[PDB]
Coordinates of C-alpha atoms and ligand atoms in Angstrom, one line a residue:
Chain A
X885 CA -13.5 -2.7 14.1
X886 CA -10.6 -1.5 12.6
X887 CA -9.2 2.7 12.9
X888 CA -11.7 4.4 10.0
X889 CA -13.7 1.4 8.8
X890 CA -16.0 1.5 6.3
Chain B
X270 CA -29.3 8.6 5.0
X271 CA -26.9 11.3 6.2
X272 CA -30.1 12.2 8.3
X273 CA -30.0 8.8 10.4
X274 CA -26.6 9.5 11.6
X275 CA -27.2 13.3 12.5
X276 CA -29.2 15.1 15.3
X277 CA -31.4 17.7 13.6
X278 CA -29.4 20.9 13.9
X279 CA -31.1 23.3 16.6
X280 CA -29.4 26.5 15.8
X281 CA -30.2 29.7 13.5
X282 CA -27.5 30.5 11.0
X283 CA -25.5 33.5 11.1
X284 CA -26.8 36.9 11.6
X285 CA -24.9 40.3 12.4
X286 CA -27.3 40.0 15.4
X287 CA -26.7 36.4 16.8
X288 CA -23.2 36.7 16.0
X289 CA -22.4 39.7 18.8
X290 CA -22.7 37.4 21.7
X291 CA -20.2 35.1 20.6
X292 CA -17.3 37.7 18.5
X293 CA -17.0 41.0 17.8
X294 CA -16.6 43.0 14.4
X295 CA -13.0 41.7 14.0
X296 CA -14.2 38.1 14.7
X297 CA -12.3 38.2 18.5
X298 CA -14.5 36.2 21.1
X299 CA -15.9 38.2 23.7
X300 CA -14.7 37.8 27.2
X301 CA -18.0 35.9 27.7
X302 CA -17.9 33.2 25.9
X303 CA -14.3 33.0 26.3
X304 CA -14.4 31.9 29.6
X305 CA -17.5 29.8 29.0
X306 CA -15.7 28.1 26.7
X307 CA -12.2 28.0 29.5
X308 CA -14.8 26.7 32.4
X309 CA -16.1 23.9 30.2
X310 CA -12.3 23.1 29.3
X311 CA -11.4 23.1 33.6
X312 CA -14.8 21.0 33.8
X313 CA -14.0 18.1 31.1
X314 CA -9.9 17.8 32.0
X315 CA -11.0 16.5 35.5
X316 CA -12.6 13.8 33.5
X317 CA -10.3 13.1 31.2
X318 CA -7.9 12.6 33.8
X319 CA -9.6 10.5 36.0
X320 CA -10.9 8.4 32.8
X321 CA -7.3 8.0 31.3
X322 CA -6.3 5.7 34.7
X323 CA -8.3 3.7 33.3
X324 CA -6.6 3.6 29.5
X325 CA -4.3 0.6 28.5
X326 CA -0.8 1.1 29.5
X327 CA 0.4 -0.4 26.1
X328 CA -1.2 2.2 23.9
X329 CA 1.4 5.2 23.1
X330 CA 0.1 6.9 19.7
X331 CA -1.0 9.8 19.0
X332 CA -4.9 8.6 17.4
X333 CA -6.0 6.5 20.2
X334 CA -2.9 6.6 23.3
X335 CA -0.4 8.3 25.0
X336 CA 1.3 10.7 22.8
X337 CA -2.0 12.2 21.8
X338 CA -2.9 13.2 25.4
X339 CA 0.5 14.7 25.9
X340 CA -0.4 16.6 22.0
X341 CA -3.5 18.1 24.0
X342 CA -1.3 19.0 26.8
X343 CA 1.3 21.1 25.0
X344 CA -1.5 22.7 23.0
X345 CA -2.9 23.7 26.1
X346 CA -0.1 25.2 27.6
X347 CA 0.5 27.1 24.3
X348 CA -2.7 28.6 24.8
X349 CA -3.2 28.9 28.6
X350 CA 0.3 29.4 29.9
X351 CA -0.3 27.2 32.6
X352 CA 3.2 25.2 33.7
X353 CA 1.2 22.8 35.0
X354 CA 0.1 21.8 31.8
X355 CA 3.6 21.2 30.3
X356 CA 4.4 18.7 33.0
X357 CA 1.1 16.8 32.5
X358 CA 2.5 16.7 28.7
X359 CA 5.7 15.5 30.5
X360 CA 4.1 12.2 32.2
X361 CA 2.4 11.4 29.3
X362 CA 5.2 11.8 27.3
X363 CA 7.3 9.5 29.3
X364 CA 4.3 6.8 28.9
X365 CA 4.3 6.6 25.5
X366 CA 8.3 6.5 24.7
X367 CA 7.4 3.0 26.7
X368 CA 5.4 2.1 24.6
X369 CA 7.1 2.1 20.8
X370 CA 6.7 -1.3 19.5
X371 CA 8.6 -0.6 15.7
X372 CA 5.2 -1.6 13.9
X373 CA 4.5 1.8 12.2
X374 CA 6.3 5.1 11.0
X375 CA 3.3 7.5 11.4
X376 CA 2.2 10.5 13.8
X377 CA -1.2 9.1 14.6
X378 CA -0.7 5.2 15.2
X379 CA 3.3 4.5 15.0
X380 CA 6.7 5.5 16.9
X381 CA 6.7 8.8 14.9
X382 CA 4.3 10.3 17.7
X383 CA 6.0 9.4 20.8
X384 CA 9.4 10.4 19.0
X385 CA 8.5 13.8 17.7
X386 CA 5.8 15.0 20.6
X387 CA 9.0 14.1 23.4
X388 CA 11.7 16.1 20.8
X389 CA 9.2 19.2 21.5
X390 CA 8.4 18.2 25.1
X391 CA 11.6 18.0 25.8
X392 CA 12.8 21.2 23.9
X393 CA 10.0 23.1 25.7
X394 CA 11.8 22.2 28.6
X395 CA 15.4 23.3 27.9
X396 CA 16.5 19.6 27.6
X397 CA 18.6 19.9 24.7
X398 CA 20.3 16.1 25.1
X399 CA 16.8 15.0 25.6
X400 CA 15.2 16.8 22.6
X401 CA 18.1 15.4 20.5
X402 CA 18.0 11.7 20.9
X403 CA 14.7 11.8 19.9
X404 CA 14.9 13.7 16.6
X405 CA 17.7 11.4 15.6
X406 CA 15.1 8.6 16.4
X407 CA 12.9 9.9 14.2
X408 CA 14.8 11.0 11.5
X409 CA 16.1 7.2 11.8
X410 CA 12.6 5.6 12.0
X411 CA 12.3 5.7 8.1
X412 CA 14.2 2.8 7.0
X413 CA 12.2 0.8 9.1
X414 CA 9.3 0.4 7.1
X415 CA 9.6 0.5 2.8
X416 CA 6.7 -0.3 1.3
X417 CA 4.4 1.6 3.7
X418 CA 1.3 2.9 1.6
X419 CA 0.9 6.7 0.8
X420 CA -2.2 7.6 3.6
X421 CA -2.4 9.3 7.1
X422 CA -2.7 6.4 9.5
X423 CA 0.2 4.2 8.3
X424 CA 1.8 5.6 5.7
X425 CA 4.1 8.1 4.0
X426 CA 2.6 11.8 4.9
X427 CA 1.7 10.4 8.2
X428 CA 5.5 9.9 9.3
X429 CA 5.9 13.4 7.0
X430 CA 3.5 15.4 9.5
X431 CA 5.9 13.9 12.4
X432 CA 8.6 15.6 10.8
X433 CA 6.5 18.8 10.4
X434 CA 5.4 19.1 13.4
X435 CA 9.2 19.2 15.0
X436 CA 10.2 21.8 12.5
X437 CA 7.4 24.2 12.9
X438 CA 7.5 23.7 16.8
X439 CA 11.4 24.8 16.9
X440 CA 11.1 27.0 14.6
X441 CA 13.8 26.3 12.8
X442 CA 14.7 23.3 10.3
X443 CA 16.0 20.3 12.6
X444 CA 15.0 18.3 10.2
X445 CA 16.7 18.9 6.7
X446 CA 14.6 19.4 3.8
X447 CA 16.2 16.9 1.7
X448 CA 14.3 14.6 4.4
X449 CA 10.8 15.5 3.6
X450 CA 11.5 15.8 -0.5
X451 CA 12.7 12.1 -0.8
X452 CA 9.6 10.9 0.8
X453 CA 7.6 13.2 -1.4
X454 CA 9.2 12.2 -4.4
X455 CA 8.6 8.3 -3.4
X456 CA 4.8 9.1 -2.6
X457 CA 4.7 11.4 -7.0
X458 CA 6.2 8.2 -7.8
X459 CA 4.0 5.6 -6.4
X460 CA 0.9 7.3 -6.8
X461 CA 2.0 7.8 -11.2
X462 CA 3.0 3.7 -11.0
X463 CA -0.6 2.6 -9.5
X464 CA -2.6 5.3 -11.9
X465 CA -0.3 3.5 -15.0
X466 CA -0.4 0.0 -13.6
X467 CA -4.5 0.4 -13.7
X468 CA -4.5 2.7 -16.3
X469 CA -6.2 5.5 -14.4
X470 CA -3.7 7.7 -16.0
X471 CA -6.1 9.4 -18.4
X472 CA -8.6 10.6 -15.7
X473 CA -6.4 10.7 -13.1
X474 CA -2.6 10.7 -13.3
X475 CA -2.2 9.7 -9.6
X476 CA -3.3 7.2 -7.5
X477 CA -3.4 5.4 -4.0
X478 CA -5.1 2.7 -2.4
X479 CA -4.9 1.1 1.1
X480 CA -5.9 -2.5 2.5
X481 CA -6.9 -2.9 -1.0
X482 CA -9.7 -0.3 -1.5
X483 CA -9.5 3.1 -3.3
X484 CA -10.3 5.3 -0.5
X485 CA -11.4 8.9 -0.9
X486 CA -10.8 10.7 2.1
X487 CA -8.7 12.2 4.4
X488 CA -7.9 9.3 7.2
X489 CA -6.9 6.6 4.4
X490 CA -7.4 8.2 1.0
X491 CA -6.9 10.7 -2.0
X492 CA -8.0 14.0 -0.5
X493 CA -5.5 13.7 2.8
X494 CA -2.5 13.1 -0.1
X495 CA -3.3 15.9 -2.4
X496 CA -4.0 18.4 0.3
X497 CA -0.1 17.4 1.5
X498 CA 1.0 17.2 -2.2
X499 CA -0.2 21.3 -2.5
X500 CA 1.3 22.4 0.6
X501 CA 4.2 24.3 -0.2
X502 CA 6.0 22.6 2.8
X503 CA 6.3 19.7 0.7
X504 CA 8.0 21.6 -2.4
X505 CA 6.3 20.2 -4.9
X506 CA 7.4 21.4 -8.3
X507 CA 5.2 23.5 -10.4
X508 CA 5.5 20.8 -13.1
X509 CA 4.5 18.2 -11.0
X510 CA 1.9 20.3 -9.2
X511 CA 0.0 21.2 -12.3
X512 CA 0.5 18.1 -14.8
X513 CA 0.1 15.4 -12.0
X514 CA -1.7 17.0 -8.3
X515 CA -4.2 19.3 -10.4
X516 CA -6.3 16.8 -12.3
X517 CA -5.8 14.1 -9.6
X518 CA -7.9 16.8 -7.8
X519 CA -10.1 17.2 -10.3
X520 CA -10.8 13.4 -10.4
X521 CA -11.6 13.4 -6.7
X522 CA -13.9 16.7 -6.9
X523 CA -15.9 14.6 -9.9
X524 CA -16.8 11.7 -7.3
X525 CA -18.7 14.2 -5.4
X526 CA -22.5 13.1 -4.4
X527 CA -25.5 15.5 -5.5
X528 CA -25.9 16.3 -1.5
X529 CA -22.1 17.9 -1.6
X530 CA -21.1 14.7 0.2
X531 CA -17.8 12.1 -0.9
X532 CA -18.3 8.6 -0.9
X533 CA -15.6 6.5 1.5
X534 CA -14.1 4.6 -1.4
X535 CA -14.4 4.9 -5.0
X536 CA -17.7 3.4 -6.7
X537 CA -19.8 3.1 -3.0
X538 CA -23.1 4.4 -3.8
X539 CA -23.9 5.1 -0.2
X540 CA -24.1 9.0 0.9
X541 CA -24.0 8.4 4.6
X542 CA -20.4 9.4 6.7
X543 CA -19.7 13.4 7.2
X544 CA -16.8 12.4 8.9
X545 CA -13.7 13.7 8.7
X546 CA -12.4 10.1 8.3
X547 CA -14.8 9.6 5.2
X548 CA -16.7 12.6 3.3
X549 CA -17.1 16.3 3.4
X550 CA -15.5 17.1 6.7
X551 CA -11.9 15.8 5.3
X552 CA -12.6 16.5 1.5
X553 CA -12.8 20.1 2.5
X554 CA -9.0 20.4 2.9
X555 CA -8.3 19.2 -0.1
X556 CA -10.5 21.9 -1.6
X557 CA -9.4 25.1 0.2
X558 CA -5.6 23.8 -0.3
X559 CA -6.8 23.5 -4.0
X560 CA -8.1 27.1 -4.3
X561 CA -5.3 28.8 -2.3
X562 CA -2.7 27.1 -5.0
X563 CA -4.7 27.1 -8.2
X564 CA -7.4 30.1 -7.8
X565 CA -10.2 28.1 -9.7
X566 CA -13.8 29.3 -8.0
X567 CA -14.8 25.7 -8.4
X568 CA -12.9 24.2 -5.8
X569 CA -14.3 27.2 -3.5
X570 CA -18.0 26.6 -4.3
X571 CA -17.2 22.9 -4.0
X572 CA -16.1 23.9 -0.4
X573 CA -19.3 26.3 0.6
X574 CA -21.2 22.6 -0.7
X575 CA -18.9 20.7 2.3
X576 CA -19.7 23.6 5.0
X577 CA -23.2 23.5 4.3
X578 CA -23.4 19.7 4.4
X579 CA -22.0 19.5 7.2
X580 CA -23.7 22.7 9.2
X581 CA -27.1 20.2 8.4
X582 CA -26.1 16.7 8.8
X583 CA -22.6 17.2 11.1
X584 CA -23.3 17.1 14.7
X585 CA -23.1 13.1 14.8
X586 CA -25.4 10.8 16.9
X587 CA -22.0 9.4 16.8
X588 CA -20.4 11.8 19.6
X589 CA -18.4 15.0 19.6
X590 CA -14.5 13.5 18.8
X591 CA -12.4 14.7 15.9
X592 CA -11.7 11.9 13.9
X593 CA -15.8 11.2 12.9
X594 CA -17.5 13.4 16.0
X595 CA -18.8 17.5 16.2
X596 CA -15.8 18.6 17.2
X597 CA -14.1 17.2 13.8
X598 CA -16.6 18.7 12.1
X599 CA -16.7 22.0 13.8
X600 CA -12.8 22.0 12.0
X601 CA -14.3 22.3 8.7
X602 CA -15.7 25.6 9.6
X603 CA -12.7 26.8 10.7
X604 CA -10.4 26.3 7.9
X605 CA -13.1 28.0 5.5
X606 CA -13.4 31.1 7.7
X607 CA -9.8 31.0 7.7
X608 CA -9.9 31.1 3.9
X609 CA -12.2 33.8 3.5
X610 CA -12.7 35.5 6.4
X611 CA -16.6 35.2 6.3
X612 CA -17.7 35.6 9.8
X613 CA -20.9 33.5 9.0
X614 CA -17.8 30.2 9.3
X615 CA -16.5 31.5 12.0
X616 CA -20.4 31.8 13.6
X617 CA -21.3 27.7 12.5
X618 CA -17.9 26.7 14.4
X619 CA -18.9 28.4 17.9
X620 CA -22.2 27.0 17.6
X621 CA -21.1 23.4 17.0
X622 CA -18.5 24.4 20.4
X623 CA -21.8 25.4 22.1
X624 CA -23.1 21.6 21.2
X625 CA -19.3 20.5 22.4
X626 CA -21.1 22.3 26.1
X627 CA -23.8 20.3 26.5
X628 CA -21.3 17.2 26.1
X629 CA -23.0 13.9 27.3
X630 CA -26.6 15.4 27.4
X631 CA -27.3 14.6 23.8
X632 CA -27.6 10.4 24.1
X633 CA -24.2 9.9 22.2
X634 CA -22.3 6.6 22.1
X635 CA -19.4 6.0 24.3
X636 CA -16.4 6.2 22.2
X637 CA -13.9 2.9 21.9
X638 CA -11.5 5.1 23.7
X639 CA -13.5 7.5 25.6
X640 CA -11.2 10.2 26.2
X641 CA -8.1 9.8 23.1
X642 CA -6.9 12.6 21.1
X643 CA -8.9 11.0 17.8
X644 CA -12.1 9.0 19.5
X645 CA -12.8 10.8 22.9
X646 CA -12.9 13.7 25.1
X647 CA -9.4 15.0 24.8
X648 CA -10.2 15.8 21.0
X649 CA -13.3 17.5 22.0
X650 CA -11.1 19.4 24.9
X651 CA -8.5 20.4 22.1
X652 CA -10.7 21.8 19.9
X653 CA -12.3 24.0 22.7
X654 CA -9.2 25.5 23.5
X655 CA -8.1 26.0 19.8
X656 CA -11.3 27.9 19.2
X657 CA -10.6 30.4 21.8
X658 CA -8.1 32.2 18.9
X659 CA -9.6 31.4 15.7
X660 CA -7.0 32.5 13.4
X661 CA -4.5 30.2 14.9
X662 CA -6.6 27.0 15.1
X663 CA -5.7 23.6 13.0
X664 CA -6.9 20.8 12.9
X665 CA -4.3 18.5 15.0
X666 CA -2.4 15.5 13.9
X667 CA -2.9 17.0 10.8
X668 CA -3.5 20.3 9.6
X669 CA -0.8 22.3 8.3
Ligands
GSH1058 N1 -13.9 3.1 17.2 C1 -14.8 4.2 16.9 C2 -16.1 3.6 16.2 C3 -15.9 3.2 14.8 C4 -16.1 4.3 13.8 O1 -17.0 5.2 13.9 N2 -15.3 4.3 12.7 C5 -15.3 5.3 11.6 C6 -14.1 5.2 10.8 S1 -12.5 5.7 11.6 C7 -16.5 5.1 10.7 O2 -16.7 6.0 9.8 N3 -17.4 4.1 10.9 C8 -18.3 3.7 9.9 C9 -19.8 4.1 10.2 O3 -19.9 5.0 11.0 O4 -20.7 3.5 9.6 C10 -15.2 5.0 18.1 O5 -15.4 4.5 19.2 O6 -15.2 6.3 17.9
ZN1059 ZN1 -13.0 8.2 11.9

């Protein structure tokens, strides 16, 4: 994932 | 739907009673717990360090890399004393200034970290030529990236904590305020521009958006601006504070899920992060900031909601980091006992460190990076040793 997804 | 993501918490609240082994009357740690607390610190380093041979050499921020190790290092020697400690910070230090790649402006993820970690490093060590070079870096970084969005990760108050943090660690003003206030002013500006450009304006005056989504929280979203628009660091102007912050606030407070709970973005219906990346655990800042400027009881009942969220659904199945872990979490406890020096806050934060003990006997995930400053053990080492003088902890890489 991308840093804070969702 | 909170509950899936959360062990069930297995601890009593406070008590006068159950409180006594932990603190005494004036909310000091006894000796005790102290040093159970500074054996599971000794006990989890030894890890760390063996684990981080194992890190990419290429990563040098602060969230997941190099510069964040070497933040954990110079916390610890502030607390412990040890000189060993400041020349770990050293090596990791020097890792990371190999590692700027002039991508991003920010603390956490860009060359801000690095930059401003090695200005302290390198003052704490009486090497003024050393410390110099790289506040004149930093200062310079700016230009390098217009058009940054407003958030902590990659944008605006994320290269404003960098410059923070150097000021507050000399002690004096290295860099000029002048610095800090045109960023602010860019950030009033922006966030007025996107509120009119939608026409927000009449709800909320301000707003901010990154990769395209309205995000709420700390990490990406409204409540990590607003709790930097409020701090007095940033010199906002009464004016601006009260006809522009305030009801921006207000906006975000009126997103709020019946559990207490903030949704990630604006318009999700799910009530499911306590994080401090999404929901309570970051949205708490934003309230106690909110109440220490404005004095409205709302924004402290709406921050007794967080704490009690997050004392039932916050030690996370998802492991015991900072930026969505227990040890995050445990933050949130802190800042409120801070606030209002109810020893019942101070109480839920030792018993979330005594969770932080029992690390890796709980079934938890193994983190992306397993022992960074924001995913892994070194967070979860940092807030263990920041716990051990209550008054004094923050939140790192972000707090002010
Ligand atoms: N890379 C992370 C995992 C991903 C993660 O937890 N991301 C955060 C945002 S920074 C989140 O809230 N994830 C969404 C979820 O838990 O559903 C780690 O190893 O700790
Ligand atoms: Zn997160």
């Amino acid at each position: 994932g991308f840093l804070t997804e969702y | 739907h909170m509950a899936q993501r959360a062990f069930p918490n297995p601890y009593a609240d406070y008590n006068k009673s159950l409180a006594e082994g932990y603190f005494d009357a004036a909310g000091r740690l006894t000796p005790e717990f102290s040093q159970r607390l500074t054996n599971k610190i000794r006990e989890l380093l030894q890890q760390m360090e063996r684990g981080l041979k194992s890190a990419d050499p290429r990563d040098g921020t602060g969230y997941t890399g190099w510069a964040g190790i070497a933040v954990l290092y110079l916390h610890l020697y502030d607390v412990f004393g040890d000189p060993a400690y400041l020349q770990l910070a050293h090596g990791y230090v020097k890792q990371s200034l190999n590692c700027l790649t002039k991508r991003s402006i920010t603390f956490l993820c860009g060359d801000a970290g690095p930059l401003a970690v090695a200005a302290v490093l390198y003052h704490k060590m009486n090497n003024e030529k050393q410390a110099e070079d790289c506040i004149t870096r930093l200062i310079h970084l700016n230009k390098i990236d217009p058009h940054a969005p407003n958030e902590m990760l990659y944008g605006r108050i994320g290269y404003i904590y960098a410059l923070l943090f150097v000021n507050k660690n000399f002690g004096v003003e290295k860099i000029p305020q002048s610095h800090i206030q045109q960023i602010c002013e860019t950030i009033l500006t922006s966030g007025e521009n996107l509120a009119r450009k939608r026409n927000f304006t009449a709800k909320s005056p301000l707003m901010y958006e990154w990769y395209q989504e309205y995000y709420v929280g700390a990490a990406h979203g409204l409540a990590g601006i607003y709790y930097y628009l409020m701090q007095p660091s940033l010199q906002v102007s009464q004016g601006k504070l009260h006809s522009l912050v305030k009801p921006s606030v207000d906006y975000v407070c009126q997103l709020k899920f019946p559990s207490g709970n903030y949704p990630p973005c604006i318009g999700d219906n799910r009530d499911l992060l306590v994080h401090w990346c999404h929901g309570a655990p970051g949205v708490i800042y934003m309230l106690i900031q909110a109440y220490k400027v404005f004095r409205e009881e709302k924004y402290l009942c709406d921050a007794y909601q967080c704490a009690d969220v997050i004392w039932q659904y916050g030690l996370l199945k998802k492991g015991y980091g900072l930026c969505h872990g227990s040890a995050g979490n445990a933050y949130a406890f802190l800042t409120l006992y801070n606030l209002t020096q109810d020893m019942k806050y101070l109480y839920r934060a030792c018993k979330f460190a005594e969770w932080c003990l029992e690390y890796g006997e709980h079934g938890c995930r193994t983190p992306d990076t397993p022992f960074s400053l924001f995913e892994g053990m070194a967070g979860t080492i940092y807030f263990l040793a920041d716990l051990l003088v209550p008054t004094k902890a923050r939140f790192p890489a972000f707090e002010l």
